[PDB]
Amino acid sequence: ILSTASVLAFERKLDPSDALMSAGAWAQRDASQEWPAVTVREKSVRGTISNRLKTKDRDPAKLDASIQSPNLQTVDVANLPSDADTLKVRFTLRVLGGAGTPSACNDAAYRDKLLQTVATYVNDQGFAELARRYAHNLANARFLWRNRVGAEAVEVRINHIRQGEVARAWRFDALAIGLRDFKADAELDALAELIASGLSGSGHVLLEVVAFARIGDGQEVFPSQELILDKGDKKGQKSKTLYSVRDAAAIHSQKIGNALRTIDTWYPDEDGLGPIAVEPYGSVTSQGKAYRQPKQKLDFYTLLDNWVLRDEAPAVEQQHYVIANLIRGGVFGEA
Amino acid sequence: ILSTASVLAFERKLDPSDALMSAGAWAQRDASQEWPAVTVREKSVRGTISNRLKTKDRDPAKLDASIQSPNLQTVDVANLPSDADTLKVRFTLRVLGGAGTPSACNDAAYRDKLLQTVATYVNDQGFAELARRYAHNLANARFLWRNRVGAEAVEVRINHIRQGEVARAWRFDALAIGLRDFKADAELDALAELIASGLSGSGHVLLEVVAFARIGDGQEVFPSQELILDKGDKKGQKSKTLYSVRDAAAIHSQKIGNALRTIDTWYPDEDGLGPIAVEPYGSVTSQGKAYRQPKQKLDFYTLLDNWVLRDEAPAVEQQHYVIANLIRGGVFGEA
Amino acid sequence: AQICDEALQYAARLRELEPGWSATPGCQLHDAEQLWLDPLRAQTDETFLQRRLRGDWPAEVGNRFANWLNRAVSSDSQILGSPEAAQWSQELSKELTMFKEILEDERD
Amino acid sequence: MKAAYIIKEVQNINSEREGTQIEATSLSQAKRIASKEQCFHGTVMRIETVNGLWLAYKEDGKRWVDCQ
C-alpha cells in the first residue's frame, strides 16, 4: 500500500557560516584581509509615544500625561567607522550533496521509493536550474539583507577553495544582476556547474563568499538581531541586542540560508511579486501571507505525497520546488 | 539442569572518554597541543511552521494566523572560528580484558559454564576478528559522527601510551578506509594485534585517539546534544543545548562507544546497508528497524542461551557477535 | 475577581508588613514594580524617589500581571480559534481595568 | 468514565520515553492494562494524564506505588 513514513529528517545541504562583517575603504578591496571589524556598541534613545490609540486613551489630558513621560532604552547599534565607506560581509558556503537520502526514516519501502524518485529526477535533469538560481542568489548580494537597499555599488567575490588555496575565483556586479530575474551568463554558468558538481555528489565544493557594498562613511549596517531576556527596569531596558561572534557584528547563518533559498518563482500567485524562499507552505513572514496553501495542491507535502506514493509526477517547476525543499532540509512526517 | 542465572552484569570493556573538540588550521596538525577549544555559544532563531498539519489546521486564515506569530527560540550553536578549518577531536581509549567474567551472578554453575564457553572461544580463535573491526572503527573517523559527512580530508592519529609517553604511534587516512568494508593493511593489523593483546588480558593498552577534519573556515561542528528541562516560556525556550565539559564542546563518551561498536555485519537482512552497532535485538534507532528479531534465532539472548546451556554452538560469525556483546556490557538475566 | 483581590491583598501585606522591600539593593529586583515598596521609597527618601513615584504613577505592573494571567489559559488552538478567546480577553480587560484604577490611587 | 491514560514503560523510575495511550474506565483498570503491556523484564511502568501529571508507577517485582 506504501503509506508515508512516520519520521523523515533531511540534513541541511548548502551549509553557510556566520557572516562576519568588517569595514574599510573602497578601491583597496584587494587588501581586505586585515580590515578591522564592525563592533556592536550601545547608545541610548528617548522616544515619544507614536502608536495608535484604542479609543479610550484618546483623552487629551491623558495623551499629554503620556507625552510628559517618555521611555528610555539602550539599543545596540552598529556603524561603519567614519573613514570607511565599504562593508565587507564574509562567509563560507559548503555544498554537500546526497540530497535524496534521509537521515532518519522508518519505512524501508518508502525510503526505496523516495530514493528512486530523486534518482529519476536527477537522471532526467541534473541540478541545473536549481544550481543556476543558487548561483544567482550568490551573485546578487541578497544575503546582504538591508545593507543592500541603499548601496551605490555592490561587488561579490566568490573563491572556490581547494586543498589550501583558491582554485577558481569569480567576481560579479550585484547591481547588474536584478533581484527578480534569472538570466544566463558566462561566469554564472561556470558557477552553476560547480554547485551542480557539489550537489550531485561528484566532488568537494567549498566557496568563500565575500561581498562589498558602498554604503557611505559611517552609515548604519544591519547585523542580525538577538532576542533579549527581559529581566530589568524600563530605563536600562536594552530593547535591541545585535548578534556578534567575538567583538564583531555578524548576520546569523540561518538568515544567509534563507536568503540563498529565494528561488521559488513557481508559486500560483503573481510572479511580479518576485521569487520567494523555498518553504513548505511557501510563506514570507514579512508579508504575512502563505502562498501554496493546502487548499491548492501546490504545497510541498501534497506534491511529495503524490509524487512518491501514487507516482503523480508534477510539472518540472513543481518538482524543482520539491527538490529545493529536500535540499533545504527539515523534519517531515506526522505523529 | 543448568538454568540460566537470574542476575548477570558484565562490566564495560573498551572504555572511551569524553571527546574534547578544539579548532585550528590545517598543515600545522603536528603543533596541535595549544589549539583553543570550540566554545558553545547561543543564538536565537525564528521559525515558520513547516510540519504536517492534521487537516483541521488547513484553513487559510488559521495558517496565516499561525505564520503571523512565529516561535522564538534560543539554540546553542558550536562553530569553528573564522580563521581555522580543522576540527581536532581528542579522546583516550582504555581496553580492559577479561571479557567473560561477569560482575554479578547468582548461579555458580552457570558462571563456570559461561567461563568455560568463553575460554573455548578464546582458545579456538582469539580476539582477532573483533580487534580488527574495532581497529577499523578507530582507523576511519567514524566517531566523528556528523563532522565527517562533508569533510574534505580526515586524518586520524592513534598513539599507544606506555609509562609516560608514546610507545607506538599510528597515522591513518580515514577517507581511504571506507565506512563499510573491513579490508587488510600493514598498520591496521599492528593496531589489531595491540587491541587483541588488550582484550585477552595479556597487556595494558591506553590509546590516545586524535582525529582532524577538514571542514572549512568557520563552519558548523556538531558536538553531542543534551536534553532540556523545559520549565520556561516558549520565547526564551532554549530548545537545544550542547554538551561541554569546561567551556569546551565535547561528544559524550557513550556516543564514541556506540561508534566504536559498529562492527556487526552478520545480521540476516541486507548487507548492502553496512555495519551496525552490536546491540541485543540489533537495532538502529535512526532507521527505526530491529534487525535480529527473536522470531528468527539470531538475537543476542537466544544465541547466548543456546551456546551456554544446551551447548548448541552457532557459526563463528554469530559467536563473534555474541562476544562483541559481552565486550559491550550490560545487565542480562530475567527476574 | 478573586485573583485580583488576592493579588492586591498580597501587595498590601507585602508593602505594609516589613521594610524588606527596602532591605538590600542590587541590580535585579524588578524595580519597575514600585507597588510592593510603597512606603519603602517615600518615608526615607522624600525627594529622590517620591517624585519618581508621584509623577510617574507606577501602574504598568498590570500588563506584566496580565501576561502572568495569560499562562493560566490553556494555549490550545481550538480555544484560541473559537469566540472563547474574545470573551476571556474581554473579562480580563474589565478586571484588569479594575486592578489598574485601584493601583492608580496610591498617592492619596 | 472512558478516561484517557498514557502508559510509559521506562528503564528506571525517572526515565522518559513516549508511551502509548489507552482509554480505561478506572485507574485500577489502567493498572491492569499496563501490567499486560510490559514488553521487557527490568523496566518500570508509569501511568500519566494527557498533560504530564503522574498517577502511579510500579517497579518490577514490587507493587504499585501510588502518588496522585
Tab-separated table of N, CA, C and O in Angstrom, chain A residues 4 11-12 15-18 20 90 92-94 96 103-106 110-111 161-164 204 206 225-227 243 245-246 252-254 279-281 283-285 288-290 293-295 301 304-305 328 331-334, chain B residues 26 39 41-46 48-53 57-61 63-64 67-68 70 72-74 77 79 81-83 85 146-147 149-152 214-220 222 235-236 285-289:
chain	number	residue	atom	x	y	z
A	4	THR	N	3.000	6.778	3.834
A	4	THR	CA	4.161	7.616	4.088
A	4	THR	C	4.809	7.243	5.413
A	4	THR	O	4.180	6.633	6.280
A	11	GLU	N	19.074	16.344	6.147
A	11	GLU	CA	20.103	17.266	6.587
A	11	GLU	C	20.117	18.510	5.727
A	11	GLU	O	19.756	18.488	4.552
A	12	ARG	N	20.558	19.596	6.324
A	12	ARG	CA	20.686	20.850	5.612
A	12	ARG	C	21.876	20.767	4.676
A	12	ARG	O	23.022	20.761	5.125
A	15	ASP	N	25.304	24.431	3.551
A	15	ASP	CA	25.612	24.987	4.859
A	15	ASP	C	26.350	26.307	4.711
A	15	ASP	O	27.435	26.331	4.126
A	16	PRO	N	25.818	27.416	5.204
A	16	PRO	CA	26.601	28.644	5.274
A	16	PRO	C	27.224	28.822	6.652
A	16	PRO	O	27.022	28.027	7.568
A	17	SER	N	28.001	29.875	6.777
A	17	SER	CA	28.638	30.227	8.029
A	17	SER	C	28.079	31.547	8.527
A	17	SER	O	27.336	32.231	7.830
A	18	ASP	N	28.445	31.911	9.746
A	18	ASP	CA	28.006	33.182	10.294
A	18	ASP	C	28.761	34.315	9.620
A	18	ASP	O	29.983	34.416	9.735
A	20	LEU	N	30.533	37.245	9.011
A	20	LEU	CA	31.254	38.298	9.713
A	20	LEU	C	31.251	39.570	8.885
A	20	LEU	O	31.428	39.521	7.669
A	90	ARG	N	31.663	38.502	4.971
A	90	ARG	CA	32.399	37.312	4.573
A	90	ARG	C	31.795	36.084	5.228
A	90	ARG	O	31.600	36.061	6.444
A	92	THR	N	31.500	31.476	4.419
A	92	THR	CA	31.826	30.341	3.576
A	92	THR	C	30.613	29.447	3.422
A	92	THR	O	29.841	29.254	4.358
A	93	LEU	N	30.473	28.873	2.235
A	93	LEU	CA	29.329	28.035	1.908
A	93	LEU	C	29.846	26.664	1.524
A	93	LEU	O	30.785	26.557	0.736
A	94	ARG	N	29.250	25.622	2.084
A	94	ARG	CA	29.681	24.257	1.836
A	94	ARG	C	28.521	23.448	1.284
A	94	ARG	O	27.496	23.297	1.948
A	96	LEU	N	26.998	19.919	-0.009
A	96	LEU	CA	27.279	18.549	0.433
A	96	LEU	C	26.864	17.497	-0.591
A	96	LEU	O	27.674	16.661	-0.999
A	103	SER	N	18.199	11.232	6.710
A	103	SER	CA	18.911	10.745	7.878
A	103	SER	C	18.111	9.737	8.667
A	103	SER	O	18.654	8.701	9.053
A	104	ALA	N	16.838	10.011	8.904
A	104	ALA	CA	16.027	9.137	9.728
A	104	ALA	C	14.771	8.804	8.956
A	104	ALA	O	14.145	9.701	8.392
A	105	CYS	N	14.423	7.523	8.915
A	105	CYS	CA	13.232	7.083	8.213
A	105	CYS	C	12.870	5.703	8.723
A	105	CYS	O	13.751	4.869	8.923
A	106	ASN	N	11.578	5.462	8.919
A	106	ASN	CA	11.130	4.161	9.391
A	106	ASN	C	10.913	3.178	8.250
A	106	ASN	O	11.544	2.117	8.211
A	110	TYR	N	9.255	3.029	1.675
A	110	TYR	CA	9.167	4.456	1.386
A	110	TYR	C	10.535	5.040	1.099
A	110	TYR	O	10.666	5.925	0.250
A	111	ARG	N	11.559	4.548	1.793
A	111	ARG	CA	12.917	5.009	1.550
A	111	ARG	C	13.381	4.635	0.150
A	111	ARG	O	13.978	5.460	-0.552
A	161	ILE	N	37.612	27.189	-2.953
A	161	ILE	CA	38.824	26.898	-2.202
A	161	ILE	C	39.095	25.401	-2.263
A	161	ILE	O	38.319	24.593	-1.748
A	162	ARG	N	40.196	25.039	-2.914
A	162	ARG	CA	40.731	23.687	-2.893
A	162	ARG	C	41.732	23.588	-1.748
A	162	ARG	O	41.813	24.491	-0.916
A	163	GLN	N	42.551	22.525	-1.761
A	163	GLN	CA	43.316	21.950	-0.650
A	163	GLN	C	43.876	22.925	0.375
A	163	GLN	O	43.846	22.649	1.575
A	164	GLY	N	44.412	24.050	-0.078
A	164	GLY	CA	44.743	25.101	0.856
A	164	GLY	C	44.509	26.495	0.321
A	164	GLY	O	44.735	27.476	1.032
A	204	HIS	N	34.095	17.777	-3.852
A	204	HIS	CA	34.055	18.614	-2.664
A	204	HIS	C	34.032	20.075	-3.083
A	204	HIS	O	34.928	20.532	-3.798
A	206	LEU	N	33.763	23.997	-1.663
A	206	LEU	CA	33.805	24.955	-0.573
A	206	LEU	C	34.064	26.331	-1.150
A	206	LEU	O	35.167	26.603	-1.627
A	225	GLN	N	19.560	40.196	14.660
A	225	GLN	CA	19.069	40.653	15.948
A	225	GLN	C	18.825	39.493	16.898
A	225	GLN	O	18.100	38.554	16.573
A	226	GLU	N	19.405	39.583	18.084
A	226	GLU	CA	19.161	38.621	19.144
A	226	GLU	C	17.941	39.045	19.946
A	226	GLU	O	17.594	40.220	20.009
A	227	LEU	N	17.276	38.079	20.564
A	227	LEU	CA	16.203	38.399	21.488
A	227	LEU	C	16.774	38.604	22.883
A	227	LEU	O	17.827	38.065	23.227
A	243	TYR	N	23.570	40.528	17.150
A	243	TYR	CA	24.391	39.330	17.161
A	243	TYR	C	25.846	39.676	16.915
A	243	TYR	O	26.157	40.558	16.115
A	245	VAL	N	29.911	37.524	17.131
A	245	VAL	CA	30.609	36.292	17.480
A	245	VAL	C	31.748	36.557	18.461
A	245	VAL	O	31.751	36.029	19.579
A	246	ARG	N	32.729	37.367	18.086
A	246	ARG	CA	33.766	37.737	19.042
A	246	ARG	C	34.144	39.189	18.759
A	246	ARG	O	35.068	39.459	17.988
A	252	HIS	N	23.219	36.125	11.295
A	252	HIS	CA	23.003	34.720	11.604
A	252	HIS	C	23.169	33.879	10.352
A	252	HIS	O	22.946	34.347	9.239
A	253	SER	N	23.567	32.626	10.537
A	253	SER	CA	23.766	31.764	9.384
A	253	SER	C	22.446	31.325	8.786
A	253	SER	O	22.372	31.065	7.581
A	254	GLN	N	21.393	31.244	9.593
A	254	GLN	CA	20.115	30.853	9.029
A	254	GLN	C	19.496	31.970	8.215
A	254	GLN	O	18.690	31.690	7.330
A	279	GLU	N	9.980	27.090	1.005
A	279	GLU	CA	9.491	26.526	2.246
A	279	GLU	C	8.241	25.719	1.955
A	279	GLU	O	7.515	26.024	1.006
A	280	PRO	N	7.982	24.667	2.723
A	280	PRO	CA	6.663	24.047	2.670
A	280	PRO	C	5.656	25.051	3.174
A	280	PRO	O	5.920	25.751	4.156
A	281	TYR	N	4.519	25.126	2.480
A	281	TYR	CA	3.544	26.209	2.604
A	281	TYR	C	4.237	27.555	2.429
A	281	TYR	O	4.360	28.330	3.369
A	283	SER	N	5.868	30.669	2.387
A	283	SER	CA	5.362	31.814	3.117
A	283	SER	C	6.496	32.760	3.423
A	283	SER	O	7.518	32.349	3.976
A	284	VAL	N	6.310	34.019	3.082
A	284	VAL	CA	7.192	35.076	3.527
A	284	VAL	C	6.617	35.624	4.818
A	284	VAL	O	5.415	35.890	4.912
A	285	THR	N	7.455	35.732	5.841
A	285	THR	CA	6.954	36.230	7.108
A	285	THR	C	6.923	37.745	7.159
A	285	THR	O	6.270	38.305	8.043
A	288	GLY	N	3.516	38.263	5.626
A	288	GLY	CA	2.492	37.630	6.429
A	288	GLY	C	1.598	36.645	5.716
A	288	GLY	O	0.666	36.123	6.327
A	289	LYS	N	1.855	36.364	4.447
A	289	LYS	CA	0.977	35.546	3.630
A	289	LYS	C	1.602	34.181	3.415
A	289	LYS	O	2.820	34.023	3.500
A	290	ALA	N	0.760	33.195	3.151
A	290	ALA	CA	1.198	31.826	2.915
A	290	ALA	C	0.772	31.416	1.514
A	290	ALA	O	-0.313	30.859	1.332
A	293	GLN	N	-1.012	27.470	-0.211
A	293	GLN	CA	-1.847	26.982	0.866
A	293	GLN	C	-2.239	25.532	0.588
A	293	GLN	O	-2.208	25.093	-0.563
A	294	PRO	N	-2.601	24.758	1.619
A	294	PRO	CA	-3.027	23.372	1.370
A	294	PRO	C	-4.356	23.249	0.643
A	294	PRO	O	-4.710	22.133	0.240
A	295	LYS	N	-5.117	24.333	0.495
A	295	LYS	CA	-6.322	24.277	-0.322
A	295	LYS	C	-5.972	24.064	-1.784
A	295	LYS	O	-6.580	23.226	-2.456
A	301	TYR	N	3.902	19.171	0.747
A	301	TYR	CA	3.546	17.870	1.291
A	301	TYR	C	2.629	17.086	0.367
A	301	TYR	O	2.839	15.886	0.169
A	304	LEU	N	4.758	16.019	-2.683
A	304	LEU	CA	5.614	14.876	-2.402
A	304	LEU	C	4.795	13.608	-2.220
A	304	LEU	O	5.188	12.539	-2.702
A	305	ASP	N	3.642	13.707	-1.561
A	305	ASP	CA	2.793	12.544	-1.363
A	305	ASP	C	2.166	12.044	-2.655
A	305	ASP	O	1.864	10.854	-2.758
A	328	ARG	N	16.756	21.958	1.169
A	328	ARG	CA	16.603	22.851	2.312
A	328	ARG	C	16.650	22.103	3.639
A	328	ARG	O	17.175	22.628	4.625
A	331	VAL	N	12.290	18.620	9.241
A	331	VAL	CA	11.682	17.437	9.817
A	331	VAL	C	10.293	17.268	9.218
A	331	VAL	O	9.419	18.131	9.344
A	332	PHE	N	10.118	16.186	8.478
A	332	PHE	CA	8.866	15.880	7.810
A	332	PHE	C	8.318	14.593	8.399
A	332	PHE	O	9.083	13.750	8.869
A	333	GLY	N	7.015	14.451	8.398
A	333	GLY	CA	6.394	13.267	8.954
A	333	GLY	C	5.421	13.659	10.040
A	333	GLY	O	5.599	14.626	10.770
A	334	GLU	N	4.364	12.872	10.161
A	334	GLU	CA	3.273	13.151	11.077
A	334	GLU	C	3.603	12.613	12.464
A	334	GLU	O	4.741	12.250	12.765
B	26	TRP	N	44.828	23.650	9.364
B	26	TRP	CA	45.489	22.504	8.760
B	26	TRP	C	46.918	22.863	8.376
B	26	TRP	O	47.298	24.034	8.323
B	39	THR	N	34.009	26.750	21.457
B	39	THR	CA	33.150	27.246	22.514
B	39	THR	C	31.701	27.138	22.083
B	39	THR	O	31.343	27.543	20.976
B	41	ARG	N	28.211	28.560	22.198
B	41	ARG	CA	27.549	29.825	22.463
B	41	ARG	C	26.108	29.748	21.987
B	41	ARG	O	25.662	28.734	21.448
B	42	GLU	N	25.379	30.840	22.178
B	42	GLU	CA	23.946	30.863	21.951
B	42	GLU	C	23.590	31.828	20.836
B	42	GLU	O	24.216	32.874	20.672
B	43	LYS	N	22.560	31.468	20.082
B	43	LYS	CA	21.994	32.344	19.076
B	43	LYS	C	20.499	32.094	19.053
B	43	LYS	O	20.031	31.061	19.534
B	44	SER	N	19.750	33.055	18.527
B	44	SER	CA	18.298	32.996	18.558
B	44	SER	C	17.735	32.882	17.158
B	44	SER	O	18.158	33.597	16.254
B	45	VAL	N	16.765	31.994	16.982
B	45	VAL	CA	16.197	31.722	15.671
B	45	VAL	C	14.708	32.041	15.670
B	45	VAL	O	14.066	32.065	16.724
B	46	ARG	N	14.169	32.327	14.491
B	46	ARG	CA	12.736	32.324	14.245
B	46	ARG	C	12.382	31.140	13.381
B	46	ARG	O	13.244	30.577	12.717
B	48	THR	N	9.115	29.674	10.755
B	48	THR	CA	7.786	29.482	10.217
B	48	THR	C	7.428	28.012	10.381
B	48	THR	O	8.303	27.150	10.475
B	49	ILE	N	6.139	27.728	10.455
B	49	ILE	CA	5.709	26.354	10.662
B	49	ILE	C	5.943	25.552	9.393
B	49	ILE	O	5.592	25.976	8.285
B	50	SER	N	6.571	24.400	9.555
B	50	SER	CA	6.855	23.520	8.445
B	50	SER	C	6.460	22.086	8.715
B	50	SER	O	7.022	21.189	8.086
B	51	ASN	N	5.554	21.836	9.648
B	51	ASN	CA	5.159	20.479	9.959
B	51	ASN	C	3.860	20.125	9.250
B	51	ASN	O	3.109	20.989	8.800
B	52	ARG	N	3.593	18.828	9.167
B	52	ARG	CA	2.374	18.360	8.528
B	52	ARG	C	1.157	18.634	9.398
B	52	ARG	O	1.034	18.107	10.505
B	53	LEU	N	0.237	19.430	8.874
B	53	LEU	CA	-0.987	19.759	9.583
B	53	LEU	C	-1.967	18.601	9.500
B	53	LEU	O	-1.970	17.834	8.535
B	57	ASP	N	-6.160	22.149	10.727
B	57	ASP	CA	-5.466	23.422	10.610
B	57	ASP	C	-5.149	23.784	9.169
B	57	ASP	O	-4.235	24.579	8.929
B	58	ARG	N	-5.870	23.216	8.207
B	58	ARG	CA	-5.654	23.513	6.799
B	58	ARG	C	-6.548	24.630	6.289
B	58	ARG	O	-6.718	24.768	5.073
B	59	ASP	N	-7.139	25.403	7.180
B	59	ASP	CA	-7.819	26.620	6.773
B	59	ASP	C	-6.777	27.661	6.382
B	59	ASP	O	-5.695	27.692	6.976
B	60	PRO	N	-7.040	28.490	5.370
B	60	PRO	CA	-6.074	29.547	5.029
B	60	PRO	C	-5.897	30.594	6.111
B	60	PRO	O	-4.763	31.022	6.368
B	61	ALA	N	-6.982	31.014	6.760
B	61	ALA	CA	-6.879	32.073	7.757
B	61	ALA	C	-6.153	31.595	9.004
B	61	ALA	O	-5.372	32.350	9.592
B	63	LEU	N	-3.848	29.290	9.001
B	63	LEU	CA	-2.451	29.179	8.607
B	63	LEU	C	-1.768	30.539	8.607
B	63	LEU	O	-0.625	30.664	9.064
B	64	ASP	N	-2.458	31.572	8.121
B	64	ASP	CA	-1.871	32.908	8.140
B	64	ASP	C	-1.773	33.448	9.560
B	64	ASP	O	-0.829	34.177	9.890
B	67	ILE	N	1.375	31.786	10.920
B	67	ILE	CA	2.629	32.345	10.423
B	67	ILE	C	2.786	33.823	10.724
B	67	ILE	O	3.844	34.388	10.431
B	68	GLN	N	1.770	34.476	11.285
B	68	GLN	CA	1.981	35.842	11.745
B	68	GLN	C	2.621	35.907	13.122
B	68	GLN	O	3.275	36.903	13.437
B	70	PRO	N	5.306	33.974	14.977
B	70	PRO	CA	6.289	32.898	14.873
B	70	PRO	C	6.875	32.541	16.225
B	70	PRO	O	6.827	33.317	17.180
B	72	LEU	N	9.857	31.966	18.761
B	72	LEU	CA	11.195	32.459	19.016
B	72	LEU	C	11.918	31.439	19.876
B	72	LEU	O	11.420	31.047	20.932
B	73	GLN	N	13.086	31.005	19.424
B	73	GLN	CA	13.891	30.092	20.210
B	73	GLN	C	15.214	30.743	20.526
B	73	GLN	O	15.562	31.790	19.989
B	74	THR	N	15.940	30.104	21.422
B	74	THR	CA	17.375	30.266	21.538
B	74	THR	C	17.953	28.879	21.363
B	74	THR	O	17.410	27.915	21.901
B	77	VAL	N	24.813	26.786	19.568
B	77	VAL	CA	25.477	26.501	18.313
B	77	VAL	C	26.959	26.389	18.627
B	77	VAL	O	27.434	26.990	19.595
B	79	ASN	N	30.612	26.556	16.491
B	79	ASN	CA	31.245	26.825	15.216
B	79	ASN	C	32.751	26.887	15.379
B	79	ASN	O	33.263	27.253	16.435
B	81	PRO	N	36.215	28.848	14.613
B	81	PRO	CA	36.491	30.273	14.448
B	81	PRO	C	36.643	30.632	12.981
B	81	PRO	O	36.815	29.778	12.113
B	82	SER	N	36.600	31.925	12.704
B	82	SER	CA	36.640	32.392	11.327
B	82	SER	C	38.040	32.404	10.729
B	82	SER	O	38.237	33.029	9.685
B	83	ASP	N	39.017	31.759	11.359
B	83	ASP	CA	40.362	31.664	10.814
B	83	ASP	C	40.950	30.281	11.040
B	83	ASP	O	42.145	30.149	11.303
B	85	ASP	N	40.229	25.826	9.965
B	85	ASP	CA	39.471	24.892	9.144
B	85	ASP	C	39.686	23.446	9.555
B	85	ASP	O	39.401	22.538	8.775
B	146	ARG	N	28.861	13.527	12.674
B	146	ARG	CA	28.402	14.349	11.572
B	146	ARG	C	29.472	15.340	11.159
B	146	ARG	O	29.362	15.968	10.107
B	147	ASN	N	30.564	15.415	11.900
B	147	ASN	CA	31.696	16.211	11.458
B	147	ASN	C	32.506	15.525	10.368
B	147	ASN	O	33.524	16.068	9.942
B	149	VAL	N	30.765	13.893	7.477
B	149	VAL	CA	29.995	13.655	6.260
B	149	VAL	C	30.277	14.664	5.159
B	149	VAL	O	29.979	14.393	3.992
B	150	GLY	N	30.854	15.811	5.479
B	150	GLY	CA	31.121	16.787	4.448
B	150	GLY	C	32.565	17.208	4.468
B	150	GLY	O	32.928	18.272	3.964
B	151	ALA	N	33.399	16.367	5.053
B	151	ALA	CA	34.775	16.735	5.300
B	151	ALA	C	35.618	16.535	4.054
B	151	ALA	O	35.382	15.619	3.267
B	152	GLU	N	36.605	17.408	3.877
B	152	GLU	CA	37.469	17.301	2.711
B	152	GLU	C	38.554	16.258	2.923
B	152	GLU	O	38.776	15.404	2.060
B	214	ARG	N	38.962	18.288	7.917
B	214	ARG	CA	38.943	19.470	7.062
B	214	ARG	C	37.499	19.809	6.759
B	214	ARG	O	36.895	19.238	5.853
B	215	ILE	N	36.936	20.745	7.505
B	215	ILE	CA	35.560	21.150	7.305
B	215	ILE	C	35.476	22.472	6.568
B	215	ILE	O	34.794	22.579	5.552
B	216	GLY	N	36.184	23.485	7.045
B	216	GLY	CA	36.149	24.779	6.398
B	216	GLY	C	36.297	25.921	7.374
B	216	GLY	O	36.283	25.705	8.584
B	217	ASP	N	36.440	27.137	6.870
B	217	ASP	CA	36.664	28.288	7.734
B	217	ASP	C	35.372	28.661	8.437
B	217	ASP	O	34.496	29.294	7.847
B	218	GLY	N	35.250	28.283	9.700
B	218	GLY	CA	34.141	28.759	10.489
B	218	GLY	C	32.823	28.096	10.210
B	218	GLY	O	31.783	28.740	10.338
B	219	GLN	N	32.826	26.825	9.846
B	219	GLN	CA	31.585	26.119	9.601
B	219	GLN	C	30.947	25.670	10.908
B	219	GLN	O	31.286	26.134	11.994
B	220	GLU	N	29.998	24.759	10.790
B	220	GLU	CA	29.270	24.270	11.945
B	220	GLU	C	29.753	22.879	12.316
B	220	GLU	O	29.581	21.934	11.544
B	222	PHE	N	29.480	19.736	15.210
B	222	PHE	CA	28.316	19.142	15.856
B	222	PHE	C	28.729	18.358	17.088
B	222	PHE	O	28.909	17.136	17.023
B	235	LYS	N	9.268	31.570	24.277
B	235	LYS	CA	10.011	32.610	23.574
B	235	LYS	C	11.479	32.623	23.972
B	235	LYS	O	12.346	32.872	23.129
B	236	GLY	N	11.761	32.364	25.243
B	236	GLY	CA	13.099	32.114	25.737
B	236	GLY	C	13.265	30.626	25.945
B	236	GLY	O	13.705	30.178	27.007
B	285	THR	N	18.406	3.076	15.688
B	285	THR	CA	17.254	3.894	16.018
B	285	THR	C	17.047	5.033	15.039
B	285	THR	O	15.945	5.586	14.993
B	286	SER	N	18.066	5.397	14.260
B	286	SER	CA	17.847	6.363	13.194
B	286	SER	C	16.992	5.755	12.100
B	286	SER	O	16.138	6.426	11.521
B	287	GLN	N	17.187	4.480	11.824
B	287	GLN	CA	16.365	3.813	10.838
B	287	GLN	C	15.157	3.132	11.457
B	287	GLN	O	14.288	2.664	10.718
B	288	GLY	N	15.095	3.048	12.784
B	288	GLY	CA	13.915	2.563	13.469
B	288	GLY	C	13.567	1.116	13.229
B	288	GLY	O	12.434	0.712	13.485
B	289	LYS	N	14.506	0.323	12.739
B	289	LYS	CA	14.264	-1.067	12.407
B	289	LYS	C	15.025	-1.948	13.380
B	289	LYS	O	16.082	-1.570	13.884
